[PDB]
Design a protein around this ligand. Structure first.
Ligand code: FAD
Ligand code: CL
Ligand code: NA
Ligand code: NA
Length: 490
């Protein structure tokens, strides 16, 4: 009662929603991306606040502290476990939903931009394009991802070999901490500014906006998508790829998508067909690339082309808030440091991807710029020595049909254990997977020991620094979820 009373004193009431508010279901559902988490059995927020000004965010946090109601912040809603808008067990929380804070102000001459966390990536990319056809920013492939969550957890895409992760190209932030105080880089200090850029969402406060450096791209880039079935020699070709691709020049990223006994090699090249073709002949002739495979286009056009296969619908693909695609979805991830034996590739393609409930596997090669950053320089530790990341993606589209895909996801993770990173088995924070472990709360604070179990998987040797920083900026563990950094205090 008095939490709401506090909010109503400080925030326009049209931006406040209780469970009985007629628009509450629509507002709650607007950026839910996973049909597992939209159904009535999920734990719902007591209130939703949709700020349009930073002062609204500050007021909400101050009210939450005064009346001990915790807040889950949502930007784009893509959290794989829905932790921006649901809790796993019954508890009281509010959602602060930033979708109305979505400005992107680009300074093309300075090659910088300020981007509100509630902007979607496609809107950031498009605003960059409205300023210049030869600037880019290296974040995700999916246009509807929120800036807030993507950057907080790192953020990587088809420019990762050239420019690393989104978070290491952030030059300032505007942030509201657990006491409602407004911060920038200067006021935050080294530890807090280090942590917020890749240490995961929620834990380190609400980022209102991010200042980014914009990076050059040529006026023409080249994409190809070359498929090889196992009959066409996919196993020998991917067995070669895992060694070659992480060693290719920084201008060339060749990822793989597999969803059966067939691998599709998808390349983004910062250059022309004219120079790509000989580069392929020299470094990876086994793929059989020729100029007919080239698709030359602008960098901005590559975003819908890589993700959707579209060539012709730039604004519709990048400016999209309809939320039409809502699979039931499960996700896992791994990092690989040693080449798979050929027999493992055989099993993946011929056996694991031909099972009931089998998902899709996406393989992103590292090396070059992402791997040149030291493991501790940012919270994102998956750097030197990484050959590739794996994402295991399971989509399905009917309720009551989760058993088979959930079992496959578990079973293939077990099969892969001997071949991927270990001690710890590394995972990407933004591919959130609650089965890696969850927090225990004791005396209303997430425990360090419970956090460490999953925390070392996402953050390796950076976990303890993250937790000490958490202890300094949020000792009472106000901003938390079931898999957020616990405070480690004296
Ligand atoms: C759905 C989806 C996700 C993708 C896709 N492709 C990706 C890619 O090409 N590269 C990537 O690096 N990641 C990709 N992912 C995963 C996403 O990056 C993650 O799912 C992001 O965490 C999503 O961010 P967002 O859409 O903003 O999700 P939310 O659920 O709102 O938040 C996630 C997490 O972070 C906290 N949080 C949100 N907003 C803030 C702010 N402003 N400050 C601090 N913390 C914040 C939330 O509380 C929650 O814990 C492709 C697709 C289709
Ligand atoms: Cl996620
Ligand atoms: Na290891
Ligand atoms: Na999951």
């Amino acid at each position: 009662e008095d939490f709401l009373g506090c909010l109503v004193k400080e925030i326009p009431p049209r931006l406040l929603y209780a469970k009985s508010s007629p628009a509450y279901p629509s507002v709650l559902g607007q950026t839910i991306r996973n049909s597992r988490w939209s159904s009535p059995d999920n734990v719902k927020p007591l209130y939703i606040i949709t700020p349009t000004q930073v002062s609204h965010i500050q007021s909400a946090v101050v009210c939450g502290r005064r009346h001990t109601v915790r807040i889950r912040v949502r930007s784009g809603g893509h959290d794989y476990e829905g932790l921006s808008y649901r809790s796993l067990q019954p508890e009281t929380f509010a959602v602060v939903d930033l979708n109305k804070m979505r400005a992107v102000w680009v300074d093309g001459k300075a090659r910088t931009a300020w981007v509100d966390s509630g902007a979607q990536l496609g809107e950031l990319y498009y605003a960059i394009y409205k300023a210049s056809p030869t600037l880019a920013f290296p974040a995700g492939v999916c246009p509807t991802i929120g800036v807030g969550g993507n950057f907080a957890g790192g953020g990587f895409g088809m420019l990762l070999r050239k420019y690393g992760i989104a978070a290491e190209n952030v030059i300032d932030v505007k942030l509201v901490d657990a006491n409602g105080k407004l911060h920038d880089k200067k006021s935050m200090g080294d530890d807090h500014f280090w942590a917020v850029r890749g240490g995961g969402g929620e834990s380190f406060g609400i980022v209102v906006a991010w200042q980014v450096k914009l990076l050059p791209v040529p006026p023409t880039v080249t994409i190809f998508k070359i498929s090889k079935t196992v009959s066409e020699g996919a196993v020998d070709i991917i067995n070669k790829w895992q060694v070659v691709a992480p060693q290719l020049p920084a201008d060339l990223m060749i990822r793989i998508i597999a969803q059966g006994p067939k691998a599709t090699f998808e390349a983004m090249y910062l250059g022309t067909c004219k120079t790509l073709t000989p580069l392929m002949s020299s470094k990876f002739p086994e793929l059989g690339m020729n100029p007919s495979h080239c698709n030359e286009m602008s960098w901005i056009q590559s975003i819908p082309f890589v993700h959707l296969g579209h060539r012709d619908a730039l604004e519709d693909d990048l400016l999209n808030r309809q939320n039409s695609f809502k699979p039931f979805a499960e996700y896992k991830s791994d990092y690989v440091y040693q080449p798979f034996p050929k027999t493992v590739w055989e099993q993946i393609l011929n056996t694991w991807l031909v099972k009931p409930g089998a998902g899709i596997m996406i393989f992103d090669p590292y090396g070059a710029t992402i791997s040149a950053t030291p493991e501790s320089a940012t919270p994102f530790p998956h750097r030197k020595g990484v050959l590739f990341n794996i994402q295991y993606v399971n989509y399905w589209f009917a309720p009551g049909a989760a058993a088979a895909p959930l079992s496959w996801s578990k079973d293939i993770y077990n099969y892969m254990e001997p071949y991927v990173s270990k001690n710890p088995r590394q995972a990407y924070a933004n591919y959130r997977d609650i089965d890696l472990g969850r927090n225990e709360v004791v005396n209303d604070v997430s425990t360090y020991a419970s956090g460490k179990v999953w925390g070392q998987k996402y953050f390796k040797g950076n976990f303890e620094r993250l937790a000490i920083t958490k202890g300094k900026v949020d000792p009472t563990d106000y901003f938390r979820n079931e898999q957020s950094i616990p405070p480690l205090i004296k």
